[model samples]
Target: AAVESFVTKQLDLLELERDAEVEERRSWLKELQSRGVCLLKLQVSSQRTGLYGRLLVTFEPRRYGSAAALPSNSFTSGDIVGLYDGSQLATGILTRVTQKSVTVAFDEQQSLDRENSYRLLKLANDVTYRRLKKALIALKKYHSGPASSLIEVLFGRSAPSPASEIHPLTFFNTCLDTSQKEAVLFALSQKELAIIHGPPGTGKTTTVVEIILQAVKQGLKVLCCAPSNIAVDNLVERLALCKQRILRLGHPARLLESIQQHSLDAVLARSDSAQIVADIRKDIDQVFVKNNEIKLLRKELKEREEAAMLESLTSANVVLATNTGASADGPLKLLPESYFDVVVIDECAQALEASCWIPLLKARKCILAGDHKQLPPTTVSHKAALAGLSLSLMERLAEEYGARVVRTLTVQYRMHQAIMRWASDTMYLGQLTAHSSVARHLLRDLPGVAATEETGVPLLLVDTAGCGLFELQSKGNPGEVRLVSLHIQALVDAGVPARDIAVVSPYNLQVDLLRQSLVHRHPELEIKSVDGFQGREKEAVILSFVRSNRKGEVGFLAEDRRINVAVTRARRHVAVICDSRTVNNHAFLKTLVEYFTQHGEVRTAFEYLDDIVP
Candidate 1:
């Protein structure tokens, strides 16, 4: 460790506020000018959350006088905006936008005290800084031989470099297959950085746990992070095996209820603390389980559990958090730079370049494990992307290093051979193979499923070619919703537990629609977007491709990476319901249709329905 010095300067809240305002103002104005829409007016509108996390208000539009006439396409769902006065502001996404009253749902709830604030939407520093940092990430410009630099050095395409010194290990006690064993060895090699590319259901976290155990055995402190809470929790769940003390960091609310017992708060809590939470949780579950009062009790339990985490940071051997949580005022921030000997980023491919840097710069050595072919980092502005913000560290490293610094885990244990081949041919270059146990199962007679052979792969595509469109909501399709409900019911009736089935889509609006309609019927199933299901798997995954239209445009569904994730989530079976005529018009969708037709089964909606009749 080296000595560091800093002299405190007088800080001005107003000056800081104005500077951010100018930055946001310049960015958005430039963004709008790029699109040929000039900045007209910044209207001040007071806001509050109405029912269902919605911002119920009518913003005065410059193009139209009232909300009623604000154009049918005033703003599409999922449009992000910044609401603020010159001094303060909050960011929110438009969940529902119509000609009349629109709704803005925030990532985090905004305070109601600020009554008068401008609707002058603008891009904030996070987006602007991310745009700028993309170049820094790509150029390998850091001086300390940071983790990103190590990734560049090992993976950089210069010449054949000999493998780093191999270290022996003693801590791991889990059985590893040949592929898993090699990935663990490469990750533990003396190189400053290495990548383990785990395709869908390839036991990425399983290998990572072994690597972490080996590192800590050699007396190295490890910092583990991921892009989402689910990914982080997945690591923590596997980490329980080593019996080593571990720390989990994040807001209590975002943590999964299933893994809360393993969270640092619960792990390190007083024996009585967990008992209190359990008592309260039991009370909430017994009566009026869905009532508003239970929500308050849930909050209380979380607060009490997290109260012990502030002072107990230095004792744990392994620490975990999402990239965003690492930047928060928690255990991660309290530790010094040299405290961690290595950093492991799970699901690194989906993380933005800037987000990875939060944990990357904190440690000298790094291990990244993710499938770049599955999904890439999310981007909002095309200009920012063209400027290089869309490239993830994992994607960039793989491109530069080729195969020298990366290893691909090819044996998948999730789907049947027929089911796995479709994704492999189109997305993964036909590199994936299935485990014998996984490939053996061929469930028969789904409620309304298609299969190439009656006893072959348990997968299908229901063609919605002639099905007419239902009345369109701003975000989801009614026609697709009805079919999704029917498919789920059939799966349930066929003997799969309600919890083992999942419904996935690309649009939040569609997810919301499915969640609302099916929650009562199937309370335990998961209905989420591809992004939300990144680190999750289920026994049966029913995909609802909601984009069906005359133009064959899929909007963001055109992102092939998201499509790759949607279909690969199932462990036993996958069923896709899509409009063949419109969906097949796109190159990727067309490829997908052909894939199901060749490897599995593709049928019209009527053909699929009629086959299931007893």
Candidate 2:
């Protein structure tokens, strides 16, 4: 009865949030349409016919306005796009997205008329939500076995068992720290649930892989999942080192090319059943109507596909997929409840509770690894956020169970000691310590900058207060862009690879401006918003805080979690570009400025870039 009630409440909340999100998008689209800038012109650069009679068309977008005028939401690979040619409209999925072109795959061949202009708009997709709701409703009706146990534990009706005394061989990466090893042991003990609190740069992925390897060594069928495709791929790449039989589940277009060979589609393609199914599908496609012969062929095709999928799924020791992919209408749906012996969710703190439950419902034992101190699940509606839609399962469990089920990975290998000190002290209660190799690392160790006292520290503060550079209305500062460009140029000229450096801003406008100003010269340099750079690291990071005003308002920049994510991304060096006078109005930023002033070098923006700029 309790499980049913909880699921019912969650379902109601999900609907509420979904409606709010759709309404928000609707208004946003209406506003964009009213502005006469919602649509982007597209020119067909190339075309090809792919498998299953799909047409792959590559288009070059023709922009009429400045970067700011372009759609705030950019199209990425795997996004749905609607292509309009005069009165007719066709929708397709974007298979590839590059700076120069976008390749979309349409279900059927599209006729192109050179005289008729074409435009493309990104279509909002909520298929994941629909799938999630379906899975939750299924659980609500029949909550038993592993799913019931997990739900009960989550509701505090029961408690998870403590770790056992049995010890496993540390064959998979023996260099794990004490906390990491503890996490592995707890997971291997077959507890119903375990939470790994991985702070930034603490080798969370490494620990997760080790736990999975240990689980597999004990002859357990492990299902590994994350909130995003890139995360699942990251695990797949690392788990491949063990040479274990792993099957990656997702769309072929969504999976990384490097790991394509391990995908279910690729694996099944090598089977005779798949060949027979494909041949039958081709035969049906050639027919105009659904005759008896076509019906028989379709039945044969379904049988063959299901047989192959079951074989692929049952034979694999480990399956890697995103949370949505696990609940997708795919091969996993064919398996019975409690089929997987263990489920491991990486980056669990960034996933919604509904998303986590999709995989959680399939296994008896579970392990969740993520940093609650970082960002939470992103919600589109402010009402939903207030209604607790933004709270992730990992965070909820960690708070409810505390140390009983949570083990924190405290030794970080990503940031220099001075660089990690501020975040550790402020966020982690000074519990985090830097690994020996990166503790003393400095940017001056590179060839470009001189080894002076000012250049030897791990942190550098570029104050832009008095340079007459104020923040623009779009949350972008032109002066900061110039300063960041000069700094990056100096790094590149000094022999630092552009690929090793990244520029992170809190606003998309600033990110767009920075990309435009630097993409041509330093195409390898990564410019992204702070949220985009989460769970990523670079050798040198330059941050652009684009809010500067006399009113001392810092908008979204005041979120302490955002600051934690921004300052902890660099390993060897970190340069903070901000107007200290304006940003210091926020207590957190003031403390950060004070920390940099005391422990690192502080200089006026002109002092660092005067010789290079103008």
Candidate 3:
């Protein structure tokens, strides 16, 4: 790495006494204009957490008497003024500014959150230096390369370009290395039907995009779809950025509200079951007449079909559909093979067994991406697969295409490498890394990986406290319960953000309890769960490990409960907080503990730090 530096001097300044005053000053001001009224008051204060983690933040000020003579509450001292960090306008605020000096003030008139500071908000200037950094993120590598040369010609070698060709899959590749790419491609390419799966941050979305790209490169126009509104919404959001035109195919939503409305309507309209069936039959008869029943039915079933599209499932050239009201026969019943060049399934495992893949396969070419990482389809839920709905179809198809070539993405990006390495016994069964010596850590031991505090901890904060949730049962299976809390606390008190912390539990009830407990005890920390942590990560995490109702046993099950919580929560630095009974009964936890205690790169991470004596 090379060194580079620049400086910006603050033109407008004031003494800040409260965090909110500071936060509002930094983040909210659009233009700093001179406010001439004996200047409205402002204050800033930092609640010292010392060397340990997450500090609290608070600020206060009077919002001036209505219609003040001057731009009264607009600017104040000790107030941290914040601005949008990027030009793309995706919002983020910076803690510090190019102006290195910080101003702090202490005053008795302000009520401050003795732990943290809030900066004032401001609209970002598209011309600001930080905005340029953001604009660069979207530039193509070729563009970045040219920009790099321009930088060299003017400023000198500035940290060899971290930019790669945006690769379309830039987000996915952010977590994956070149080696994992091969593994993923190997898995993706082999499936007659495949499942590319994971909890959040597993890169399912990006990899699927990559798979689609790869398929396109191989001469196939891809058709894609999903079952849920969120899943479809995200897929389309991602797909829309691509150069190709996408048609959402597949499933729809079962909005309970809509279902009830339909029921009421059917009663009001006197929708006779026989008449509905007769209408459907007549439609089917017409569709069959041209052997394009699927196409015309899709056209005829527009309202019914669209009713399910509750999301983007119908927007693309490749329709994206959901698990409900979806049939392997729908697209087959709607359009012919010519409608698409190839079909791809995202989160294949979540699809009801053979059900999600069957219709996708019926297209000209088929690609299945799933991660059997979570739950699999049971007899009760499966339709049109090698199970109950239509068993032989998948078997026959698999025999021809090699039984839905399954691709497992072993390397994960969401959890702290430290947590992943330690929790591997629970997650990947010890095969995740091939390294020796420092093998047990979440991240395979590489040079200087232990400087987590100085560097950054790779973890996630799911921020689910305000999200809707409910209790989930584990069917009363016996399993060990472990809470990896103490380790988390240790990391945070050392300088990591409370926002970086994650608290995962299978049941919402459990998560709520742990959250309340952690918040009660720590009082100044923030936490998120595995589900909320999806598609995001934290620099470090204090995992609040929740034990399953089915305590000591271990085997992969599509878990919505605790085990899934543990495995997917942290991106690095995972610690197990468990009772001796739970820890002693499970070999997984013991081996996991031993791995961290012994070879974890971070095992002695704190020991090597520079010691400061009081």
Candidate 4:
């Protein structure tokens, strides 16, 4: 039954443009300039360039490592990094890494014409296409939608044969809103497909954990996956509370330190076999560390140890992994087909449609939880994007179903009601409502701090009109960074803890600049791009709009969704710093500027310059 469905239903419409007249798809190289631009210098000291496609190149050691005493290298096998030469961009993956050198394999073979060189390292594709093996097969051979019954069942329009009584998971405590309870019930009905369209701060993960535990209680094995490691860890952290048989499957390096205890390796290490082996060694040490008795006992102990590890792994009720890791390999490779009855995908909107199949093919039911309105999957090929390859399955399904079966979470729990009002009206079309006392009116002057609220806006906007816009397109705005640094001190002076503060910028270069500039004095501060802050929030977010140019160009900061995400990230306060003159150049930003001005929320940097000169 599983094989038949896997062949028929799993065909999963990978349909590409069949018209021969269309131009050839732009390779990943051409798309990097528009989507993500990474330029890093590669100083090759000694390199063997004649080796077919792979080359061993030696560099200053500092290129890969940051510090000499405790140097760090950021690379992994099969990780693609790109560099731009005079006319073309070269791409390569690191096959090996050493203390002072790395082995790289280029897309095509080329000699080291220039010794010490710099190239554009193309940024990582958030939803990688390389993992679309099944999708590729479907495109050439089998292009079709999932079963009609599956679709109907997923939409809650039909139900499969009734299931028996469910012994719900225990050993945990959690409170769910009315909306979350409805979702949990819908998922428990054993539908072929279900979607939870959770907007930001609606407790998507909380609902996800409940669905997972409920499914497990219904005597169904669960496979939980997300686009990133953090998303998986987030679910694992909550699901472990059920104290059910669960194993987080991932590499030690990639797994979060906090959730590593639930990983297969960690769990097996803490197994009875490990302790038994240690005990045998102790007995040998009594003989006494190891003689004939130690070796004989150790051999049998090794066999049982491996058996115990496998038993724990195969018997787990819940498994967690990233999409790439969940597919027939990373964690599920050893498990049999139909091992997991339900596949729960968190952040489903961020995963490529093809990747969804990797785990979906094995499970009988699927529950997708994410906000389609937020970020979509990233594609490097412009041709692929035009062909709708970047559209995720969750997004596509949401469009097809509308609100028929998709459940929307409206309660605002993450941000203050005062701070959420503007975002709700402007971005979400007023779909969100704040009902939490904890998140209502959180902004206030500290006991000793003085009040300066010209406008009662919970989120404040600072005008950098007097300070001219100094922008480096490839880097960040130093003026904004300086202003934010001063603002951070002012916030600290006003009494928010350093741990509660986060600096958000839209540009990676700007994030790097701010992190590098502030790490010396305020190393505890969280500095990241808006993309980096997705699915994550903070108490007080200090955001910097880095594009301040004489021409009034805002670059990618003009995306309304980016603004929505940045503003909604703060629970208590949202302080935005920007050059008003240049910000007014953009239409959307200009509207915001006008709004802030009319509301008396615009605070000039010079107004506070007298008080804060540090």
Off by over 4 Å in 1: 1-162, 167-174, 258-312, 328-330, 444-457, 467-475, 608-614
Which ranges in model 2 have alpha carbons more than 4 Å from their true place?
A: 28-41, 49-54, 62-72, 86-90, 107-117, 277-286, 289-293, 447-455, 608-614
TM-score of each: 0.68, 0.92, 0.44, 0.71
TM-score leader: 2
Model 1: weakest 10-residue lDDT segment is 1-10
Worst 10 residues of 3 by lDDT: 7-16
Alpha-carbon RMSD, candidate 2: 3.4
Regions more than 4 Å wrong, model 3: 1-204, 214-219, 247-317, 325-338, 377-404, 407-417, 422-494, 517-536, 545-565, 600-614
Best by lDDT: 2
Predicted candidate 4 versus true structure: per-residue lDDT over 159-234, tens digit per residue? 5535332444342335667777666666666457778988788888878887777677667788888888878888
> What does candidate 2's lDDT look like per residue over 271-344, in tens digits?
76557855856775758454355666677678888888888899889998999888847679878766898899
RMSD of model 1, in Å?
A: 11.9
lDDT for model 1: 0.66
Worst 10 residues of 2 by lDDT: 64-73
> Could you give candidate 1's per-residue lDDT for residues 1-614 as a string of tens digits?
00010001101222243355566456543344423222223332446653322454445444443332333223445456666555436666554554444455554533544233244343433543442233233334445444444534533333433566665555354556778877888788745777889989888878888889888777778889998777888888778766877878734335666666656656555454656656754764656555455565677656654545544556777888887566634456556557777889998988775567667666768888898988777655454455555677788888877677787888888887777887888777888889877876654433344343432347778777765542253458877787878777776665667777889988878887898799888889889888778768887788988877776666777888888888889877788888877787679878887877876666666754433321
> Roughly what TM-score does model 4 have, to 2 decimal places?
0.71
lDDT of 3 by residue, 1-614 (tens): 11122111000010111222435445433235323211222233334321111132223332452222223332333232331122221222222221112223221122334233233343324222232232222221122322233223212343222222223332334555453475356533442334453434546667777666666555554556543434555666566567544443311112222222222122223333344445655764665567434565545456654343322222334444453323433443444334455556564544432233334433533455544444333222222223232222222233343422334455555554455554455554554542232223343233323445423433322211111111123321111111234455555555555565555444444454565456656655555445544333444444433333225433222243234445555454444332222333455545544554464433221232233231
lDDT for each candidate structure:
0.66, 0.80, 0.38, 0.66
**Greater-TM-score candidate between 2 and 3:** 2
Lowest lDDT 10-residue stretch of candidate 4: 17-26
